[PDB]
Symmetry: D4
Subunit: 169 residues, 8 copies
């Protein structure tokens, strides 16, 4: 099981590392690299064409602004492509979101929330989990952990009250 | 291989049938039914909890307005959930899109374009294709067909010119 | 008279405490806890189903992003549910607002301004006030106080002038 | 139990009648009239001031564009005020929504979806239901009916299939 | 010649003082005070009704969020009312702008840019200038000064170059 | 007393005639013509420069899309300029509104609602009314008529009910 | 002198033909064909790479939704690329506009108005006109014609009045 | 070969200097100065009219808010005009973008991304490059450099990993 995590700019790396961190938590092997739709277009084409042959099963692609990388990758490969819209300073990622999610009929990108590379990681795991029972188990376990974590927070708030909860937060 | 296609309202069925049509084109088995997050919440919970056990591997969920169904389904199941934002008369589906795509960290929905259930179908196939080589082949073949279809249109436009192309279109 | 104040994340607590503070000012009893639509969905269902039986008469629910908690609570309980859209870093709470206010026909949420949990508190009091004359009196008195406070500010500005008013502000 | 339904323009009546229809379904007494914030401001002031004394317990107010009526009513009365943003031809009710929902601290309006006067009716009933057990029962029963109605639609879709469902729809 | 400058909150005073400063530059007499549409509605009504009798000829009104003050003032008085939309932390004044500029037919507010109370001052002067030739002259002179100021900046940039211009800026 | 009504395109005339109709109702003399910022820029400059000398006291300017005409006119003349944003097919006049209302410091345009040339007419009258007591009286009388008209509608709705009101509407 | 006009879908041809019509009016030679970024990506790459060698000097590219074609073409060729955002049914071309205009640093697209292929034609001519004096003359002449056309309309409106102008329009 | 870089305010100079820097990198001669559409309108007219005669072949114009400068320049000159929308504090440059890009039919502005004067510089070079082979070569070389730079970053990320890449970044 392997995921490719790509982004156009190393300015995107603070956000996109979040997908790597989740995948590491799940024990899922990945590569993370730079592929610019606009500055290295041939490299993008080659990456998308060859990903399947190299054992990549899901691609997570991040891009900001006029964010073409996920969609262009999905136009080339038959693999599932997940798009992370990266927040822009001007339009707060709305440009990124529309550029990725609004793919015309024929070529989908699986779009997640602006700046939410953690969720692109979890979605990649959920996709992998239909094929790899071990990964399905890891996702189930993750969801139970998240539940337990909220239950503990709720219990604490109910026990110490908002004033004290905030003073310690 | 099985996909569940759900929607909250039969008003969503004109759009959501597009996912069924694609899946039929690919020979992928599916069920299509109504599950309302807001009017049948227990039914939604039960659907999401039991989908895996029944052999469903991907869920495609459509919702308009304050569109909670995809996200609530994804909160319950570990399966990949694809969200189709259905166009609203007031805000043209922008409310639908934000309600689906902006899932907080922990629980992803794979969001596609407003009203683009055809793309939710194709994405479901691409996801299935990592497990089922026959389906991967069908997606590859679909992409080659789409290519050939554009090449034929381009050739025709270049041969008869825009005036005549439009007169016959 | 009792109000339930819920939120999905303890990150929402700085905002949501504002509803608690108002209710305390009015002498209205409340509980405040964490209930995550997406990470503890069963807990949400159970909270909404049982609130009436426990004497809760109004629920104030806060959520950010794809903000499903108020709407899902309102789908389950017949009690009035007030939704506080919590500001997001990316879309400044616009995603939150659309996710809450745009509830389809059948299931309303009483939506107030982005990040305005103080107003969810006051609205809960106004609702309670139709049943509890003491609370109606407290709301009337609050409105008279707010009036008197503005009158004093106006008098001061007119007496010392904007320059000095700002220098002391 | 009594609800006041007001709107600034008789152009709003096609939408606002939806609240009257729901209230009639629930057996809740109401008045429906025209009160223009901008063309009859004294009338608005007088309506808001005197509503409580006349036995009105909830006000439903509709307005489009720069939609001030709900908020101005809520500034005057201590009663709960529900705001229906009416769709505008230019901005599709976004102007209406912001004008109503974004009330500053101190004065809430309970805002529902653009053009959704049906939901303002149901919310008024849910509010009344905390005081009047008969009304609480009517809301519970309404929610069970909505559930049963979706279950029947789902069963039908599963039995006759989407093609036939749409042909009869 | 007299202008009334009003605002709902002393939080608006940093912005609204800009109108006072311009008027002072033009030698135009004004009053500046607090009038809250939502917290002192009777005071607002009284202010608008009596402004003409007191010699006020133009009203400049600032408001943020669900910004009703300019429009409500204009509903009551026949005097020209200029609306300053004050920037909100959540929606950056877009809510303010729609609440003010989108007045339905019958009752106009003269709307200027978000947070641009300086321009409300200049517009008030331009309005006064049709009646008071001295004020018309002051506005003409202001426009010539603004021109001369830009010409001097342009000459400087052309003489010292952008690097040095920025180093001194 | 004289108002100049200008627009860039005769496509704007259906909307802009509304200002002429109001002015005619008030007995205010006006001219209405075409002045294109983008196709006849010299004509625009000349119109703005000479309006005062010809006895024009207020200019009403309409423009759609990148709507520069009001702002450019206001940059040249010291007279008050009122901007009507004309609705566009693509962005429903939002582009028009931002292009007009967001004038930087120094040069105001009095902006009214998208497509609301009727309100530009009334605002022009309110402005004229500070100088011409006869016009002030006409505006006062107009506001009383609008009030009486709403009172009659309200009485009718209360007398015949919504069903019948709508059947006759 | 030669311009390439490309679009991803023959659904874009009604809009994009407008650029061809202008170019024909100016006597500028062009080709018009279909090149889909998403369905024929290799064809797009090849088109962009080879355009210069074939004598193309400006490319006009139209795309709707997640509109990647102009930007991807500009990433490959050093030629000036003009982007026409094509209106979408859901978001009225706002998605198209952001996808095209918001190109990150390094790779520009010359973006014109949503659906305004006529302006992409004129811009292509203005660009060509710096090299070809005959084309510069044609653009100058076009601007003089547009001026004369507005002057004639203005004269007519002033002569027959708005009522009659509209009756004949 | 010569480019004119203009802006309305010296507040725009931090952004607009980016176009100068690129042009300097390409060895392209330019002038940079202040031309205010709204404060020096005659100067704007004169600049646009005379640019061709002075050897200017492309104009780059920056403006914020109601950003009329690019469009007004393009209305006057037959030269290609590139518009840089400058970010505003309130609406983050969305007002700027709509004011520039949404030019009606007849008069185009070549619009680039909000605050992206670097791209206006590169576009000016691409335009110049159709006439000046030396400049075409410089743009080709720039694109190859950008490619090589991304390839080196990608290699580094793949060699040292994201943790270390970020620690050194």
């Amino acid at each position: 099981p392997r995921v490719g995590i790509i982004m156009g700019s190393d300015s995107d790396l603070p956000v996109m590392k979040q997908a790597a961190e989740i995948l590491e938590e799940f024990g899922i092997d990945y590569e993370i690299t730079i592929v610019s739709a606009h500055r290295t277009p041939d490299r993008m084409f080659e990456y998308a064409k060859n990903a399947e042959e190299r054992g990549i099963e899901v691609i997570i692609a991040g891009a900001g602004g006029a964010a073409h990388l996920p969609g262009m990758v999905a136009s080339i490969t038959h693999l599932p492509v997940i798009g992370v819209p990266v927040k822009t300073s001007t339009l707060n990622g709305l440009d990124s979101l529309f550029s990725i999610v609004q793919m015309p009929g024929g070529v989908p990108v699986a779009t997640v929330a602006i700046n939410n590379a953690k969720n692109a990681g979890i979605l990649a795991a959920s996709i992998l989990g239909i094929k790899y029972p071990e990964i399905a188990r890891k996702v189930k376990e993750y969801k139970e952990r998240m539940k337990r974590e909220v239950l503990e927070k709720a219990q604490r708030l109910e026990q110490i009250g908002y004033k004290e909860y905030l003073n310690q937060k």
